[model samples]
Target: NINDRIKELGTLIPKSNDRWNKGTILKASVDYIRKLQREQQRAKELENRQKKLEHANRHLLLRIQELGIEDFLKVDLRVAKVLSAERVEGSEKLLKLTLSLGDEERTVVAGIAKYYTPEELVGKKIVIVANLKPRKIFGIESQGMILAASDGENLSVIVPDRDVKEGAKLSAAL
Candidate 1:
């Protein structure tokens, strides 16, 4: 009975020789079907990845939505100097910073260590989101958020466009 089924499969292949053994017929059929299986699986993966990217694009595509306004005005932007920087221990991507907003200094925890060095980050004038409610991160008090430009690959702290004084308002390079 199995030999009869094997004979039927042998006739299905476009064989250039009619004297192929049963083993050759069986192996060739398996190899052909396996190729189809691989192609189908690859296409399935592409579709799933495309679907996830479409979902992510909805939130990151901030070109024309989420009306932030007078509500946005409630948030304050202050230019502050990085008075000191320290790489926080026990965390790979955390950096502790002391910033001066001209009159007073505040400490903030920033997660930009992967892209910045504690030694190189000192004295750079960075813009920050002041007036944000404080939070304790990793046993340290975080008073504000620093503003930066991140094009996905490169992340740099936003600095003054020129010699603007500390504590100036707006992305005013203050």
Candidate 2:
């Protein structure tokens, strides 16, 4: 029954448009959905409509579920400053980034070229998953992963509140 409900929601919206139509219900037990329903009822009585409802970061939530909460909490988030960034050859979406982790330098491939320029990324301090196994893309070995958040259409990387030294271990609050 749960699978059928999820599939019904899937049929109602495309994966890329998941962030839109903010008040649509999925997962009946979620508190946000309950809150949204209440708000919708209130708006109807007041003859007003809510412009936007909260949107869930579904991909991140699914990843956390797949990895388990404790395992996901153990992810090694570290600070790295971008030393260099360039578009990957033959790929419009991929950017090859060189990062300075204080003690060492590493390369990471990120799919942010469409939203960010190489010049803008360089020298920006950002959080990254430091312990991921290396992956080779187009012959370049990416040693870590750059963290980014998207609202389907827009994309942004997680930058520190203030400039911190490269290779600093991000606190648990992250």
Candidate 3:
């Protein structure tokens, strides 16, 4: 049982060096099984769409497109706490934020300044795309992207209603 677990049960794999780096072995094992048949699944119509329902926002929910397992596995979503926030210079809708991810701290830039003040954003818990390819904005490299909901006239950052520790993981499924 220990070895099976440490070796990953092969359902949803957790994030760890041993799990990620061990993919070489996994690919080989999976490749072996593929010899039995040609397993090719191609789903057409990939980009996305908008859904309108219950008198809701026209483009509110993306018609819930299906994703390939490979795409979903690449995401590393986590809940983080806002440590500080400040309006970024040279921008009217961007705010620089420092987030506590429990094991580490990261800085991110979010365009929530129009709806959220730096004072109100501090100490708020929000979800983030932790492994986003970092990018420089206003000279600061934003380490991640915040997850928020938006509509034609309404915008808000997504948050956990109940208290939770920072760096709490989100899940994915095929």
Candidate 4:
């Protein structure tokens, strides 16, 4: 009887009542599978719509049409030279760096201490946004931000391959 019920459900074919005990179990399982598929499709559509809205609200439109990211271009990012570097008193993975950006200096906290040493950072040129508002990190004041590449896992600083003038502008077309 169970085998006959399974075959009938497979093709929705007519079956004798004594041969197929009941069709409730097969119907419920089919419904459950259909429900899960619908939920998955809805979720995928929602994610796509959210990303589209974010792109529209951001500078994506202009960046694609005019080749100028005006909204984001207002940010003042420039190159600076690391004048001094020292370890944070109680932190082993962070270092405080004093950077000279053209006409000013800023204290920046960087997490590159694990990959680099304070002694190695000193006298090294770097890229930073000197005009960024200051913030406190681990009780230390960080006046600017350093640019980095995010791989959705870890971040790596983006440094110039060759020596560039302090306060050099970094720009791109689109």
In model 2, the clashing pairs are none
Point to the candidate with the largest lDDT: 1
Ranking 3 against 4 by TM-score, winner: 3
| lDDT ranking, best first | 1, 2, 3, 4
- Model 2: residues with Cα > 4 Å off, grouped in runs: 1-73
* Candidate 4 structure, TM-score to reference: 0.56
TM-score of each: 0.57, 0.58, 0.59, 0.56
Q: Is candidate 1 or candidate 3 better by TM-score?
A: 3
Model 1 scores a TM of 0.57
Q: After superposition, how far is residue 13 of candidate 1 from its true place, in Å?
A: 38
Candidate 4, residue 65: lDDT: 66
Give the higher-lDDT candidate: 2 or 3: 2
RMSD of each: 10.2, 20.6, 26.8, 8.6
What local lDDT does model 1 show for residue 12? 74
Candidate 4 achieves a global lDDT of 0.76
Q: In model 1, what is the error at residue 121, expressed in angstroms?
A: 1.4
The segments of candidate 1 whose C-alpha lies over 4 angstroms from its true place after superposition are 1-69, 171-174
lDDT tens readout by residue for model 3, 46-160:
2122222432543444445657778887998999999889887778999989999998999999988999998888888899999999988877899999988889588888888
Better of 2 and 4 by TM-score: 2
